[PDB]
Design a binder for this molecule. Sequence first.
Ligand SMILES: NC(=O)c1ccc[n+]([C@@H]2O[C@H](COP(=O)([O-])OP(=O)(O)OC[C@H]3O[C@@H](n4cnc5c(N)ncnc54)[C@H](OP(=O)(O)O)[C@@H]3O)[C@@H](O)[C@H]2O)c1
Ligand SMILES: NC(=O)c1ccc[n+]([C@@H]2O[C@H](COP(=O)([O-])OP(=O)(O)OC[C@H]3O[C@@H](n4cnc5c(N)ncnc54)[C@H](OP(=O)(O)O)[C@@H]3O)[C@@H](O)[C@H]2O)c1
Lengths: 431, 431
Amino acid sequence: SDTHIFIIMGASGDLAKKKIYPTIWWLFRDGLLPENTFIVGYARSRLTVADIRKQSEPFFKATPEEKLKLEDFFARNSYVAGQYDDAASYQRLNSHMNALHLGSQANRLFYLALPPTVYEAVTKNIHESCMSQIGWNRIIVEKPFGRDLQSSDRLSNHISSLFREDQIYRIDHYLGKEMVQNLMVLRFANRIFGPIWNRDNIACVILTFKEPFGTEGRGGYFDEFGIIRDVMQNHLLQMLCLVAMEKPASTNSDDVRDEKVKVLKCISEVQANNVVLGQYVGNPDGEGEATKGYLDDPTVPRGSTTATFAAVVLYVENERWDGVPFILRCGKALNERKAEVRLQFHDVAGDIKRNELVIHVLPDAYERLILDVFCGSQMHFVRSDELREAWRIFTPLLHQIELEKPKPIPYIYGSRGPTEADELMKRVGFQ
Amino acid sequence: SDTHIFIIMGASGDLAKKKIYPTIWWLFRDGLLPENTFIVGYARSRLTVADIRKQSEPFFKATPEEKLKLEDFFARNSYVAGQYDDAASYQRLNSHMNALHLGSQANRLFYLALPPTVYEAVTKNIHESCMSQIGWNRIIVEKPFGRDLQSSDRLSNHISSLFREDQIYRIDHYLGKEMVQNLMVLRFANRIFGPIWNRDNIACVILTFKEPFGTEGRGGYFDEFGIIRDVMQNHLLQMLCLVAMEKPASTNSDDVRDEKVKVLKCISEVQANNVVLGQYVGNPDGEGEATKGYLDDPTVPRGSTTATFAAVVLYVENERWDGVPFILRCGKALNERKAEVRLQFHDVAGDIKRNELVIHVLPDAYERLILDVFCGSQMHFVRSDELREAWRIFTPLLHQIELEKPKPIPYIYGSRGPTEADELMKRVGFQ
Ligand SMILES: NC(=O)c1ccc[n+]([C@@H]2O[C@H](COP(=O)([O-])OP(=O)(O)OC[C@H]3O[C@@H](n4cnc5c(N)ncnc54)[C@H](OP(=O)(O)O)[C@@H]3O)[C@@H](O)[C@H]2O)c1
Ligand SMILES: NC(=O)c1ccc[n+]([C@@H]2O[C@H](COP(=O)([O-])OP(=O)(O)OC[C@H]3O[C@@H](n4cnc5c(N)ncnc54)[C@H](OP(=O)(O)O)[C@@H]3O)[C@@H](O)[C@H]2O)c1
């Protein structure tokens, strides 16, 4: 219909204060949210809308000329305090939403801006209390979607034991503002160069994610996950799918996601001989944060073998791609800020250097993602089976890394990474 | 066999002194010429090898460590003086070549480093005097290959009335050192993206040749030809062919040139409504040669309407390409030194900006060209029918330009050119 209720489960938190509230404010300001939209925060800390405004408006980039729409925005805001497993608190939340103007009939969008540890409880109570009877119900869940196949399956089975898949929105938006554009142009490239992309023309494909900055005083959070879970398993794998997929049945989100899952179901589990791990150390001659290494970060626990750079070779195993190596190379604190997809060709030149086709890169990625959840297009959101296949591919390697704790290869801040990664590339065929 | 005689008809001249002798010296120095190679200059001016050495070795980049191979090179050099229509002088040349070590059996390569005005006479006498009886005979003819369809046909029929087509080498090497590489990568791109390049995926193709420098005190020679004859009619048209051509029967020079001619035979004669002409004027705020315009060049005759920039729309007319506009945009004194081929796609994006595939760019072009004439690969040399078709396409427009003398559009030194050219691009569909 026309009435929407934006619930922010965990509004007192960092993501809600620094990102969620500013982005929904920007969408409302630019007239992109539906006209009859309400925003409701929910957490345990006893707050008022004035407190959330006080702590969040610094991030709003509020100018003196848009203060009227800002007052309207905060007039459409409310806050309800309660526990995350207290049935009475969810009853109070449900009644408060039912009290809003034509709130009964309204579509409800729940942003689970909460540590995943509590998701279980929340997804239960929301199911039995706060769901809508008429309007649709959509849940936005956040990283981490587990850390291995077992945890991710238990969490995904719990969530997909209460809400249908067309109600679950797994959002990933921390790798830049051009992520959605990355995936869009890669899908367009697959639709265009479909007939050319075979094992006959291509000898090797690469997917690169370089960032020239380190952890920057926040390596503590990165340490618990690693560069494989942060970049490769979710993003680089999704665009590998987008590259290697067949022509979808249509332009429905579900058909192209079916093709992505069909691609994932052909990638066998990666093993350590096809993997090079690296950790960045301080540059002695550079200046600034380049002088500090990974272990020199105050937040990083000492003795951490966590890889901040990974080069991994995968193989799609069907008739279209066989023996064609997909080299996923990503790493923090490198030489450039580059996200590219290069496909090297079988040369045939008769002559009496290898050629490659390269793919580089109004609303930002996160803004477009929220607006997509509003429209209901699950295009840029990973599905349950897609996530399960990705975790299946990368979880034996990850279990080995956790058990044996292999020391990563040291590479210098600003370098391209270990030379052993380039050796691994040479092994399967490259430049 | 193993013995080669490099005749330089017109060795006293500018091209021979500044380019031909240095490049054959570089080939001999790098061991690329056949071991039993002799070089023979021929002109009317009474010279000795010492004189040619005196006037040409400045351009040799001679270092003190290669002086021995340089002495050997000039030992393999000789010079014969005589007129260009004197039968006795050609008899003396033929006898002198027959006197060289096993010169009778030797392959003979004639470089017609002469004004085309005399080619006729030369090609006659060489035919009846200096050709070899055993070894092959190959002629290198130079620009201009006529200035319109009639002159080019009379010259080409005269030359192809004495030497078979596998003996005629029309060389064009003045547009940079990467021309051969341009054509090679474009042929590879056609062989790869063959199935994609249809009227169904592509809405517009462009071929760009920008140069940031003006005429530089030598606009007098450029005035007699124009930017259409200098860049478009020969080079941009050849790479248009390379883009739009079908899959050749093989990798023989003649099969791919057959495909290029088949492409040319489908381009009807261009008319002035699809053409934008421009002339560059001095930049008032820039410095250096940018302060001087085209007419401010001392060599340029005043009142010259000669276009130094051209934007021309052509159309291949078959089933693979129909209504697909090929926009050939070239010009001196522009913003960049760019040579690109961009193909814009029919977007289909459903959504609740147009994409394009872009193609940019050991021996230099001219060096590789001479070495090709030695090997005998007529790949990067225009054929008689190819040249005739190009002249047919561009000669009615050129005749109109000569008759009516239309004033070109003034554009500033360093600019991208006339805005009317971009209007013409918009008319048929672009960005
Ligand atoms: N790159 C990434 O993977 C990435 C980056 C940023 C955020 N995230 C995800 O985004 C979500 C938002 O987290 P955040 O970083 O913005 O802030 P947060 O402090 O983790 O959580 C926000 C709210 O969660 C509640 N909370 C926190 N720990 C809790 C616990 N142990 N038990 C019960 N309630 C608890 C608190 O609400 P009250 O005390 O007011 O009740 C807090 O204000 C998380 O799930 C996080 O994983 C992921
Ligand atoms: N971008 C271009 O299109 C371009 C650029 C450079 C060169 N070229 C071509 O390259 C060729 C070489 O010419 P060049 O510029 O290097 O020098 P050139 O001075 O034009 O010719 C070299 C020799 O030609 C003879 N010659 C010149 N004019 C003559 C005439 N009217 N009658 C008889 N003999 C004559 C002279 O030999 P002697 O007096 O010793 O007998 C002279 O030393 C030309 O055909 C020119 O078109 C084209």
